[model samples]
Target: HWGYGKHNGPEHWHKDFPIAKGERQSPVDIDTHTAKYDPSLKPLSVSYDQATSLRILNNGHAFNVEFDDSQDKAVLKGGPLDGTYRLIQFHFHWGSLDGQGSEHTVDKKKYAAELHLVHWNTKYGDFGKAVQQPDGLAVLGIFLKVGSAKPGLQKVVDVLDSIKTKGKSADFTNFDPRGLLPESLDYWTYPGSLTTPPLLECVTWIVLKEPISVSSEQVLKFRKLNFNGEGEPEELMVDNWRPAQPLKNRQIKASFK
Candidate 1:
């Protein structure tokens, strides 16, 4: 199986998944200077309900907070999307150190971490079907910088102990994901793919310009989570982010000048 280790990391993914070398791969370096300002792009519209959050779990690659996407209760619209996209889950990617972790960088500048809000276009009926379409997934990427503690993120940190190993899960309810967003929704949008294996080229990436705050202490809590199963050799779940991919012929459009 593909992993972040040297033997089966991103470098070796192409051996199994040929799309790894595709033109629209994600986590690309955002060249702020070259990004075009799109006056036509609308401000992002995100409405998330606390009741939709189901549970948080360790999936070996990263811990995810799954949401109930049966309805349009927690949905995202506008900002380059043609239709409403329902929020299905959100997860994080980080490094062993604070200087580098984020998958997508701004002008080659790396952040402490990155958060991805995975959503699927509702017109496709369900996530499975949506994943197969070109305009299926819409992922909102937020950069996380080390600084003051974030109360919203702390809520997730507090539950880390309960899901310290892979496959472990616990109830994660009544948590509003909107609280985790930065004050400004100014973003850069582009055509991209999933950062992990089965790196499908069906994502509409909306990466926010501003980063949210996260404390060093809170980040340490995330490092405590193990990537290994209950009885396997323990491995810290750090540096789960994939490095920036090539931009190729794609043009990145910014909502702000």
Candidate 2:
């Protein structure tokens, strides 16, 4: 199975999933100096209803909080997106240490963690169908810096004890994700793919320039979660982020000057 380990890590994924080397790969390093300012890019519009939150689970890779996307309760528009994209799920990527864990970096600088809010284009009908289309997905990325504890994240951390191993889950409701957002919505936009396997080239990446805060102790809680199943050999889930991919010919656009 593909994992973040030496045997089946990102470097070896191209062998089993050739598209890993394809153009439009994700998690590219963002160099602010070269990123062009785009006046045409509109401010991001994120409307998430707390009632849509269903459950949280450890999917063997990252812990994700799924949303009920059958309707337009939680949707994202504007920014680099052309149409409404329903919020399906949101997950996080972290490392073993607080020094470096984010998938997308800023001028080669890594953050303690990263948050990815995944949404699918409504015109395509469903996430499965939309995922394959070039304009199917729009992922909002927020960086996490280690500082004062964020009360918004404490709710998630409190539930981690229930899902200590892969495949474990718990009901997570009435949680407004807007609480996790930073003060500013300004972002950098680009065309990229999923940072994980399957690595399909169909995402319009909106990476926020501002970052939310979390404590060092809070990050350690994520490290306590296991990658293996309940009975499998013990393996802590960390460094679960992919390295920066080649920029190739893509241009990164900044919403702010």
Candidate 3:
């Protein structure tokens, strides 16, 4: 009985981890239906402001960011990536197998992990208030692997030294996120619900066709947060990622012309 060994292990987790018993999750197999190439379909875009205070916020489950865009007085818009979304929160998804930790799976193949920079339509309102809206959300999905040349992420990880522990964050100045997006904005999209619980079906899933790679060290460090309540110092436990679900008869559309 080589179990997951912890109070916060997978079995101890609440049922919300998986979607409605039979519902299909993401990381779906790309059918590549008519696999066309369109520069416009690419949905990735970002901005880096030295004043944005890229602090890592701890919300029990994992580390995230509350991007106060009001301070920068600047908003990022369309490119290969669309939405003109306002940055809200950033978080990660890992696997129970340690070696496998990606959010979206293709036909059953998973990756090391995935980072989500959740954004929303500024037209509605603030991120927190907007995410509840059907069309109020837009998120950037960054896939990670066990390798080098991950581009822009290095600037972020470099901050780990300062915000290494729980509730720790830094000013994170002199940074830019534009370079992180994959070159081929071409992607597959579908009408799937939010990867998170209370699964909102209003999400416009704009998954990119490309993924970036980073060292295994970065992956492990991101998962080491202490989310244990009270003074129990539990290892924030493990396996923050959820299993891939079905598209529920939904067609993943790509933004190519």
Candidate 4:
């Protein structure tokens, strides 16, 4: 029953999910100057086997590129993590228009979009079991700025028309998500919740400092998709991001000085 719409959006989610009012929530502003640099934070390690990429789904919230995580086919480790985090799926968060879409902002600046590559800690066994733990998930955030076209992402952009409605899915394989990342592995780490409900505070947020590039036209296509189902009124899936939550007493750590 929870979604990005006004009546049942982030503001009203606390009624059903009490954790929505919890101290540690996600989509926080990353103030770099004040972030404590931790030398113990190692470089991010992403080992993704291309063939494991399975299907792309349009769940009416956002388009998610799912992967076969039954095995450790793709995993993210090191950096601010304690153990191996197996890649389950990756998705995006964007606004209705350009320059104001991303969930996580830096220095009070918002980008066009944000990519969330969700992984679960293998030390906990399965993702369902992991989500219940404090250190269950590790979501890597990559900001997408408006700029030149990213040809590597064209494959995903190409299928937007096919899966524009809710519950639609298409086979998407052999595409490696690693190619979409920025050159620098420098990042800011914090403990936060999933931006969407039930807003579980089980994620270890690893947000990259450097942003990736995407064309203005490509971003508009993301806006074309609808959040409503096939029979429901056409509602543009744009501006589906949650507002920035309070930082509380949590200290954000940086991998680089």
Error of 2 at 102 (Å): 0.2
Cα deviation of 106 in candidate 3 (Å)?
1.7
Residue-level lDDT tens digits of model 3 in 7-91: 4343433364444333433445555654344544544445645325356655555667556666433344564334556766677
lDDT of 1 by residue, 82-170 (tens): 99999999999998999988999999999989999999998999999998889999999999999998888888999999999989999
Candidate 4 deviant stretches above 4 angstroms: none
46-132 per-residue lDDT for model 2 (tens digits): 887533888999999999999999877889999988989999999999989898999999999999999999999999999999989
- Give the least accurate 10-residue stretch of model 4, judged by summed lDDT: 45-54
Number of clashes in model 1? 0
What TM-score quantifies how close candidate 1 is to the native fold?
0.98
Candidate 4 accuracy as TM-score: 0.97
**In what order do the candidates fall by lDDT, top score first?**
2, 1, 4, 3
**Model 1: which ten-residue window has the lowest total lDDT?**
45-54
Whole-model lDDT per candidate: 0.93, 0.93, 0.58, 0.90
TM-score of 2: 0.98
TM-score of each: 0.98, 0.98, 0.74, 0.97
lDDT of 4 by residue, 1-257 (tens): 88888788889889999888798999899988999999988999988764388899999789999998887678899998989999988999998778688999998899989999999999999999999999999999999998998877888998889899999999998878977888898999999999998789999999999999999888888999999878889999988898888899899999998
Q: What TM-score would candidate 3 get against the native?
A: 0.74
RMSD of 2: 0.8
